[PDB]
Write an enzyme that holds these catalytic residues in place. Sequence first.
Site, PDB file in Angstrom:
ATOM      1  N   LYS A  70       0.844  -1.189   0.000  1.00  0.00           N
ATOM      2  CA  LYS A  70       0.000   0.000   0.000  1.00  0.00           C
ATOM      3  C   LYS A  70       0.880   1.240   0.000  1.00  0.00           C
ATOM      4  O   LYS A  70       1.657   1.459   0.932  1.00  0.00           O
ATOM      5  CB  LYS A  70      -0.897   0.021   1.230  1.00  0.00           C
ATOM      6  CG  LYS A  70      -1.887   1.187   1.278  1.00  0.00           C
ATOM      7  CD  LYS A  70      -3.288   0.761   0.815  1.00  0.00           C
ATOM      8  CE  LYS A  70      -3.376   0.403  -0.658  1.00  0.00           C
ATOM      9  NZ  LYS A  70      -4.829   0.145  -0.992  1.00  0.00           N
ATOM     10  N   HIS A  97     -10.124  -7.273  -4.914  1.00  0.00           N
ATOM     11  CA  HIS A  97      -9.969  -6.254  -3.915  1.00  0.00           C
ATOM     12  C   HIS A  97     -10.499  -6.684  -2.576  1.00  0.00           C
ATOM     13  O   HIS A  97     -11.479  -7.450  -2.487  1.00  0.00           O
ATOM     14  CB  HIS A  97     -10.727  -5.029  -4.406  1.00  0.00           C
ATOM     15  CG  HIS A  97     -10.851  -3.929  -3.394  1.00  0.00           C
ATOM     16  ND1 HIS A  97     -11.951  -3.793  -2.601  1.00  0.00           N
ATOM     17  CD2 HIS A  97     -10.024  -2.841  -3.124  1.00  0.00           C
ATOM     18  CE1 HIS A  97     -11.787  -2.700  -1.813  1.00  0.00           C
ATOM     19  NE2 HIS A  97     -10.621  -2.107  -2.150  1.00  0.00           N
TER      20      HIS A  97
HETATM   21 MG   LIG Z   1      -6.304  -0.826  -4.650  1.00  0.00          MG
END
Ligand SMILES: [Mg+2]
Lengths: 420, 420
Positions: free
Chosen positions: B190, B317
């Site tokens: 991330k 996701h």
């Molecule tokens: Mg993403």
Amino acid sequence: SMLIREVRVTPVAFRDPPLLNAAGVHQPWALRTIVEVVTDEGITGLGETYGDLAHLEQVRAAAARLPGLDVYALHRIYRRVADVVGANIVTDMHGLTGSSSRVKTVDRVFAAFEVACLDIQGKAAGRPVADLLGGKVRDAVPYSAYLFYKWAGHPGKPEDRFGPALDPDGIVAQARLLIGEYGFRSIKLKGGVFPPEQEAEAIQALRDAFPGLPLRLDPNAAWTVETSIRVGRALDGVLEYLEDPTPGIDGMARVAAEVPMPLATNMCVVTPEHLPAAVERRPIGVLLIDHHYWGGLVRSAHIATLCATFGIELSMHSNSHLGISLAAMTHLAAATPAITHACDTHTPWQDGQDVVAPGALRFVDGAVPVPDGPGLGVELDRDALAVMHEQYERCGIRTRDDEGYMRSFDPSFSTRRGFW
Amino acid sequence: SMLIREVRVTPVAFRDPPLLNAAGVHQPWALRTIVEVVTDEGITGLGETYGDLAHLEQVRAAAARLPGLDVYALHRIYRRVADVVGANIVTDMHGLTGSSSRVKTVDRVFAAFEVACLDIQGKAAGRPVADLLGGKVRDAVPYSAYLFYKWAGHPGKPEDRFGPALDPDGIVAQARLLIGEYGFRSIKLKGGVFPPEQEAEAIQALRDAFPGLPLRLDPNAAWTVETSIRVGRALDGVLEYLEDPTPGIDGMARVAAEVPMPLATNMCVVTPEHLPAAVERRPIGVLLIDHHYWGGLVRSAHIATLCATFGIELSMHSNSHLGISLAAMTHLAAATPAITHACDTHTPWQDGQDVVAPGALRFVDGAVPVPDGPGLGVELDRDALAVMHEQYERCGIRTRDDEGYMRSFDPSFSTRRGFW
Ligand SMILES: [Mg+2]
Ligand SMILES: [Mg+2]
């Protein structure tokens, strides 16, 4: 447990009138293959597919290799079919469902088994197949009246009860007959038989005789781009849609941009590999889906979603067929919100011939109520199946060939493709 | 019969570490809503969705209006949800799953019920949910290690067992920890937290420490087009894919044409209305599907088919979630041939917290074996549900707000969108 114990494969032939089309004329026997899947538990499912010899051979080969697989295992069954088919590509003699390809061949072979497995799943769960597809969103599925120019009968055989239809009066009379019997609220005319001007005349005669009924015209790609545009413009405000006026994605897209009604196809978009080019060029506003060559009910439902997303409406294509196919078509249409146009069917032309029991599929006001009970809602009539199998054995036809049959009468005929 | 008798809706909160992202930092409690559908027969199904207040209100409203409907009647349930939602559009505070819309709102509300109805159908048929989707095509579903920059703990609370990660060494250490425990064979970082150059450094450090493992980087649209192209080029041959480098279909398509690896999204294509523009511009090579906002497992499977057809690969996701969601994600991935990339999951971060029983979902060599038995294969632990509901009641958070939380520490912070 639900393991397949055996798969029975039965080729059948049944009577068909001399229906004319761009590829010639229907032969006096139409062929199908009936599939019956039986689980170790004795639960049975039915499917129905084409009867052409090369297809039949693949269906037999695949069927022999399904015992031991589970009926919920549709991905695995599909892979097994793909293994059997290999790179063999089965191509028919008429081209009226577009080009052949590997995936289309695999999907055609897979579909009779998928439909039978869904019938079994529905039986196990005690639900109609439509419940396996999200539940019916309509109680009955509207079908169109499928009109054809036709001879009074096959040469050398008795004339049929429908009579000849070779001009607008005859076509209108045929329509009165079918609508009177079945209640159809939409009308489709098979064209590519007479010069376009005469078929346009028939369309106009129908509009005058049946105000308010959507009309469709399908010349199976018999016209050039320029002729198509002329006819399309001349039929402004009359057609629900113009189906396959001209051959090819390119030609179709060029026509579509210059005529006032949407174009439909079951020829230039007939397998998923076709869709990206179709979305790019926009040859159509309406796709006729057909579970017999898009790979069964579930795959068909997937394509329906894909079409809706890109703004392509859905109708449904038919080939001469019996009640197993009719039941499958009806559960698919009833459970698919995007299938909104009346579906096509050849049912009237088969004049009651069938291999299932009598009280399950009926037309009421042009529509087929989704069957009551588990699975497809139909029951094999084994004697009727035997009767049609015996007819297949001695009918002398093994592959559909409208063009060869027409040529027996007119040696200079060739399938009409961009001909007018 | 299978009529819904009641639907129980339970908001829950559970602990989450201070995971950093483009929108700020995760709050100390993550919220979810647990749904339990019960048939007149007493068969139960589970679903799991977001816990945000405005969503929870819609889920409650819809749940109140489902009794009397059949669990196979998914189209009808979907229409009932659409009726309840009306034109209300629920929009979250972070934008990390893209824009809100009517259909997306309806799909988000529908999905918890659809998953529970499939659980019930699987139970009735005695089959896993994967069998309702065509059967599993793989025995276990690979997941990625989801790495985050993070603080050592939430300010004013105990530090967690994971430790801080604020540079490449820390990120590599986090990866060793997760891979050691779960066996993940793919890694996702991330980003959008530190300047891109530093996140590229972390990616390189990971590649050196874990040769052969596909790597992904996701800055949640924190970069400009020019910065994205610089980073993409600088990471040539390193990334499986670059996920949402820059905001918008236009920007994404411009980046995609100038970087060597495929782009992925869960922000610019998040509902079916987005797909035609996506097919035209090609902002992505990889779509992350997510049944929580694409409208349940069946609709997700439909979109998977659509993507494969147009050559867009599929990944999945995740948002912080519990075992009902994990089971649903796993049956969906296991039964969908096109879902070929490792799926994302936040599971490690929840450090064992759950509302289902213990022995059904396990990671073996980075993958989750599809559960044994009927339905989802999980069993509600009603005491654990009560514990988490009591936590929701007093946790003081009602809507996810990473940005507001970050701003409590840095008043000048704003969600990073085309910021670097
Ligand atoms: Mg993403
Ligand atoms: Mg046609």
